[PDB]
Amino acid sequence: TRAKAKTRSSRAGLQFPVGRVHRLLRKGNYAERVGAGAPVYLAAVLEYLTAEILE
DNA sequence: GCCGCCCTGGAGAATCCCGGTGCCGAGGCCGCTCAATTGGTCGTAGACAGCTCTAGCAACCGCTTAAACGCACGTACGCGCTGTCCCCCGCGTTTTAACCGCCAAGGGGATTACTTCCTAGTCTCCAGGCACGTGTCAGATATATACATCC
């Protein structure tokens, strides 16, 4: 009985994809392990910088 | 009496406005579809605690001595002014090639799918290279002592 799946971006209240950023961090040869909050934080920072330049 | 010239009225055509209908840009909807999500398991990265030894730090001392500082002088150089000439800019005219639109065939390269096999990851065991400490040894250096000599 799986629950209703929701995205990690909606959990973090973001528009940038947390899962895509996590996959690019895991396959980008940056470290052996990637923490859970690191793609959330990096997606938030990227979304903020995009918001500043777009405004 | 006959013919020519000036003044004024109503009907035909051009233009503005509105309604019906067709076409371009964008958004909602649907379908595929693959990558994010969820759930469970497990190994290990890192947090935590503990002991030992070394570096840093605040505030003080004392001594030395070379660097910093202050001052006077002088003169070299930054800067302003003037001349001059030359070279770059503005403009008119002529050329010319960039740009766009065309063949004509062929290869390079990006994808999609598939097959195969070689090579690199992983695991276990072992041994020798690297790091550290030390005994020993030959080259470099300083002086002890003996011989020739000037006054």
Side-chain angles (χ1 to χ4, degrees), chain A residues 8 18 22 25 34-44:
Chain A
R8 279 188 281 173
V18 175
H22 194 200
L25 273 171
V34 181
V40 173
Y41 200 112
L42 180 50

Side-chain angles (χ1 to χ4, degrees), chain A residues 18-30 34:
Chain A
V18 175
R20 182 182 296 198
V21 162
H22 194 200
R23 196 205 64 229
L24 288 177
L25 273 171
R26 277 194 271 98
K27 300 288 96 176
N29 279 311
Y30 296 117
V34 181

Side-chain angles (χ1 to χ4, degrees), chain A residues 7-54:
Chain A
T7 59
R8 279 188 281 173
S9 293
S10 70
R11 278 206 168 86
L14 300 168
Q15 313 290 309
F16 266 46
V18 175
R20 182 182 296 198
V21 162
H22 194 200
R23 196 205 64 229
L24 288 177
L25 273 171
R26 277 194 271 98
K27 300 288 96 176
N29 279 311
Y30 296 117
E32 170 185 338
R33 292 140 63 88
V34 181
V40 173
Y41 200 112
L42 180 50
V45 164
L46 285 158
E47 186 200 300
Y48 165 82
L49 287 184
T50 316
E52 295 284 311
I53 295 171
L54 277 178

